[PDB]
């Protein structure tokens, strides 16, 4: 998270951290609980190469990384079959927890959007994670979950920005229909925030509008963060999650 | 270059090194002389972000990098407008030198393929450059130019290799029609070879079949090197080069 | 700490952590609480070059670095005037807390040894700290205070071992009278432990035999850890500390 | 070499480079040819720990590191038995070449000073080497041999300077009688220059005054470069070198 601050313990009960086995169980990507047995994440966090499920653990909503880990094994990794790179798209994946979750008050599921929700510019939107706090700067210990409010920008407004300072022909779409743009030179997600939730408050309900995907660096001039547009992939998601 | 050895002094008169300004004029990509005033290279060497011409130099064939240079300024940089990433395609660019070079037998142009050459599986193909000699292993001093013979692998055969150990649907194609596969687990190109030539002898003529473009690591099981297929951009090229 | 084990929450209430101001208040050395307003550490941690008090903080006994930080400012740094490098000796310094500590049960001073105690081989000694767990191998998150039981080795024998495999003349003393040796190839202190306490259990009471000073790497053959011999500088310490 | 400039090809024919075995024969220290079969260098380049002769080779006067290497094996390494660290002193060592050198106009010996030469301030002195061009800043390729003229300083003044902004007692010696100081905030030796020569032109003859030994950083205020004072070890040297 670039800009924004440390999150209150009550907010973002759906936030999860993904761990890879090493010298310690290290955070590498974010995620969200969308069902007591299912986590939504970014395909590039776990793909496109096939990886050992034993090497992976999920940690549910924690205020600081590592302090009180209760790591959770994973039974299935479902990566969207159109995915190969985040720029080509379909950067979305599903993890099946080995057991459904103890759904309390501090941890519970985020609500998915109706297929009809567009999230027009001006909607109140927040992204959260334990990623870098600027380009090439790790989040310092004790690793607090951070949050930032990011301004949404229309895909076409955003697409044109991406052509500023670029050789890429104007007729060539950089920001694709299954994507969504948000953030500015002061508010953004970054490396390590990947696969994490972008949530907007619509009529009093938090809906996950996006999954953190990619971008040209973090909070760079004319390079807003790019998210997987969740609505776009609702059918593929409901095919697997109850 | 992975595998392969130092190139003899006579071989590869069309090889060049691209140099970015810094504490010294550091090699970052390969390239080739295709006309006395034009250099062929990879788009991702010089894009998609727009570069400062003043910070770029061309160095014609040297046996050893940095020992002594005769850096040549560039007057234009043409990046294929379709390019955004190497995986999407169109990984190709042209550098116009500020002055034409005076060609000799130690430094002259490479011949481009006829507008329909095929390059079947097998076939004598060589790739050269000053890039890494393995995954995360720099070419050591005195930085000799390296060559390696690499077997072409048919596009369809190669695309199927690329789906092994991958989540990506067999209907989704990773190796595109503007791309070409070469190399194996012992013989391959690597970081810093990007933009350099893949050449094949055809009826006693060296033709440039490919530009070093990308791959999944270097010399990795079932992940041959990927090249921009030159034949596919002949028309584009000839719009700019006499 | 090489080898050993995470310290139990009720042990070593005199352990302190030294923090330097940066992107976060980072641990760089240990120290011990020997008086409610004084902390004992190594000179090489804070010298020989004079530093700014403002950029230094002290953290009292914590089970996990950084998590419940309550940084304490210091009003004075006193460094033994005979100190230039760890090898030459006099590697010992004092920090005056700006304010005295409210001695809890989880936080109290350690006892200094009487001038008469030489800590023979065979004594139950521990060294504790948050340093590296091996040569060039950081303590992983969440940074549990570690402890290791270390075998004391007599100076003359230790000094002789330091000559094994070295060019240095047997007549040249490497291990001085104001130093003390402890540890083997499975048990040792390391980088990040400097300044912390070596304590021994004598006649019911914990005495601080040593301050973590230097060595040739950590847990290397014929290279035991070197500590500053506390008894050697009692006068100096008592000049400042009631 | 900090400050300064590339050396002419005809200058300093006694300068050598020391190489350690690895992925390539990498420069790690300078030295100087004092006899057709003997190299003079710093002890901290080869000790205090004893190492494999096989792992070491010597390169004679060469303009650019690595370009036309003719590496010479070494038959014997003799380190001064008083050496333990540079700060303690006796930072001097001799390498015996396996076979004598064919001296010429481009490679020959430097002359050792008489016992009575103090090298007072005002003498014209140079240091040469392939070391860092500033703190944390490698000599860039093609790795030219460098030189810098450095002002000599008297010992008592050098010693006192080193106490400026240090905790060390004014009466505790930092710069010993076997050392010699030269340099300022603009001209100095650095990491990788170690062991190479410092020469002064006395009565029309170049003499070796010192051996690059140590210092606090490079070209830091009040921290001139510190050299092993060659006259001090003349008897030791003459015990091995005809
Ligand atoms: C021209 S396409 C292109 S961009 C890009 C790039 O600069 N990255 C650096 C920042 C990354 C994406 C990758 C790191 O993880 C996150 C998370 C959020 C955001 C949104 N603030 C941005 C990022 C690449 C890295 C390799 C290969 C092609 C790449
Ligand atoms: C899943 S698509 C994907 S692969 C890949 C990857 O593994 N790289 C490492 C090796 C690179 C390509 C990039 C480095 O330069 C050369 C040159 C030749 C070859 C042919 N041997 C291969 C390479 C990426 C790096 C960032 C963003 C998406 C990437
Ligand atoms: C021959 S004198 C000599 S040794 C040495 C060395 O190897 N270091 C690496 C390990 C260090 C000391 C320094 C790192 O901090 C701690 C803490 C405890 C221990 C005891 N387990 C050992 C160490 C030096 C480093 C520079 C300058 C002269 C040095
Ligand atoms: C307080 S004693 C102290 S200084 C110092 C330090 O700053 N170093 C960095 C610069 C070094 C000496 C070591 C690196 O190689 C050369 C060569 C020439 C010069 C002359 N400009 C200076 C240097 C140490 C490093 C470890 C252990 C005690 C050290």
3-state SS string over C154-211? Answer: CHHHHHHHHHCCECCCCCCCCCCCCEEEECCCCCECCCCCCCCEEEEEECCEEEEEEE
What residues of chain D lie within 8 A of the CB of B23, using their CB?
Answer: 137, 140
Resolution (A): 2.5
CB within 8 A of A30, min separation 6: which ones?
A15, A16, A17, A18, A41, A128, A129, A130, A131, A192, A193, A194, A195, A196, A197, A212
CB within 8 A of B4, min separation 6: which ones?
B146, B147, B148, B149, B187
Cβ atoms of D152 and D176 closer than 8 Å: no
Q: What share of chain A is helix, strand, coil (3-state, %, to 5)?
A: 10, 35, 55
Cα nearest neighbour of B85 on chain A: A87
The partner residue sitting opposite D24, judged by closest CB among B23, B66, B140, is: B140
Q: Do D82 and C167 touch (CB under 8 A)?
A: no
- Among residues A32, A38, A37, which one has the least CA distance to residue A12? A32
Element (H, E) at B155: helix B155-163
| CA separation, residue A11 to residues A105, A108, B182, C110, D157 (Å) | 10, 11, 52, 43, 64
Q: Report the catalytic residues of B.
A: 44, 91, 194
Cβ atoms of D213 and D91 closer than 8 Å: yes
Residue burial A88-123, b: 16+ Cβ < 10 Å; e: rest? bbbbbbbbbbeeebeeeeebebbebbeeebebeeeb
What residues of chain A lie within 8 A of the CB of B165, using their CB?
Answer: 49-50
Q: Which CATH architecture has domain A13-109+232-242?
A: Beta Barrel (2.40)
Cβ atoms of A217 and A191 closer than 8 Å: no
CA distance B85 to chain A (A): 8
Cβ atoms of B72 and B99 closer than 8 Å: yes
How far is Cα C11 from Cα C1, in angstroms, rounded to an integer? Answer: 16
Indicate which ligand has the atom closest to the C-alpha of D85: 3
What residues of chain C lie within 8 A of the CB of A67, using their CB?
Answer: 64, 67, 142
- Among residues B39, B29, B1, which one has the least CA distance to residue B192? B29
CB within 8 A of C241, min separation 6: which ones?
C34, C35, C38, C94
CA distance A79 to chain B (A): 6
- Among residues C186, C147, C105, which one has the least CA distance to residue C7? C147
Q: Do B24 and D141 touch (CB under 8 A)?
A: yes
Domains A1-12+110-231 and A13-109+232-242 fall in the same CATH topology: yes
How far is Cα D147 from Cα D134, in angstroms, rounded to an integer? Answer: 13
Element (H, E) at A158: helix A155-163
| CA separation, residue B62 to residues A20, C91, C173 (Å) | 44, 54, 55
Cα nearest neighbour of A47 on chain B: B167
Ligand 4-lining residues (CB < 6 angstroms): C 48, 84-85; D 87, 188-191, 193-194, 212, 214-218, 225
Experimental method: X-ray
Residue burial D80-92, b: 16+ Cβ < 10 Å; e: rest? bbbbbbbbbbbbb
Report the SS3 class of residue C134.
Answer: strand
CA atoms in the 13 A half-sphere facing the CB of A46: 33
What residues of chain C lie within 8 A of the CB of A66, using their CB?
Answer: 141-142
Cβ atoms of D226 and D158 closer than 8 Å: yes
How far is Cα C226 from Cα C89, in angstroms, rounded to an integer? Answer: 10
How far is Cα B42 from Cα B32, in angstroms, rounded to an integer? Answer: 10
Cβ atoms of D23 and B141 closer than 8 Å: no
Residue D203, Ramachandran bin (φ over 0: left; ψ between -120 and 50: alpha; else beta)? left
CA atoms in the 13 A half-sphere facing the CB of C21: 9
| D:207-236 residues touching chain C, CB 8 A cutoff | 216
CATH T-level assignment (fold) for domain B1-12+110-231: Thrombin, subunit H (2.40.10)
How far is Cα A26 from Cα B103, in angstroms, rounded to an integer? Answer: 56
How far is Cα A193 from Cα A1, in angstroms, rounded to an integer? Answer: 7
Q: Report the catalytic residues of C.
A: 44, 91, 194
Interchain CB contact of A184 with B (< 8 Å) = no
Interchain CB contact of D23 with B (< 8 Å) = yes
Residue closest by Cα to atom 2 of ligand 2: A85
CA distance C228 to chain A (A): 31
Indicate which ligand has the atom closest to the C-alpha of C216: 3
Cis before C142? omega within 30: yes
Ordered by start, the domain boundaries in chain C are 1-12+110-231, 13-109+232-242
- Residue A15, classified by CB atoms within 10 Å of its CB into exposed (0-12), middle (13-18) or buried (19+), is buried
Cβ atoms of A193 and A1 closer than 8 Å: yes
Eight-state DSSP code of residue B160: H
Query: Which of C215, C218, C225 should be mutated for ligand 3, with most atoms under 8 A from CB?
Result: C215
Interchain CB contact of C50 with D (< 8 Å) = yes
Cis before C217? omega within 30: no
Residue closest by Cα to atom 16 of ligand 3: C191
Q: Is any ligand 1 atom within 6 A of the Cβ of residue A87?
A: yes
List all chains that touch chain A, counting a touch as 3 or more CB pairs closer than 8 Å.
B, C
- Return phi, psi of residue D55, to 5°: -85, 0
């Amino acid at each position: 998270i670039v800009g924004g601050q440390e999150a209150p313990r009550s907010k973002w009960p759906w936030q999860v951290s993904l761990r890879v086995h090493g010298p310690y169980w290290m955070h590498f990507c974010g995620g969200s609980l969308i069902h007591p047995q299912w986590v939504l994440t970014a395909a590039h966090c776990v793909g496109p190469d096939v990886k050992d499920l034993a090497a992976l653990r999920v940690q549910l909503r924690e205020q600081h990384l590592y302090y009180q880990d209760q790591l959770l094994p994973v039974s299935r990794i479902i990566v969207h079959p159109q995915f190969y790179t985040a720029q080509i798209g379909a950067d979305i994946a599903l993890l099946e927890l080995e057991e459904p979750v103890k759904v309390s008050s501090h941890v519970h599921t985020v609500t998915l959007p109706p297929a009809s929700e567009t999230f027009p510019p001006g909607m109140p939107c927040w992204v959260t994670g334990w990623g870098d706090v600027d380009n090439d700067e790790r989040l310092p210990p004790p690793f607090p979950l951070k949050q930032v409010k990011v301004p949404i920008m229309e895909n076409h407004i955003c697409d044109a920005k991406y052509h500023l300072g670029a050789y890429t022909g104007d007729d060539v779409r950089i920001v694709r229909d299954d994507m969504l743009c948000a953030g500015n030179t002061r508010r953004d997600s970054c490396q390590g925030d990947s696969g994490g939730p972008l949530v907007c408050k619509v009529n009093g309900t938090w809906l996950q509008a996006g999954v953190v995907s990619w971008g040209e660096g973090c909070a760079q001039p004319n390079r807003p963060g790019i998210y997987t547009r969740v609505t776009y992939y609702l059918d593929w998601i409901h095919h697997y999650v109850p």
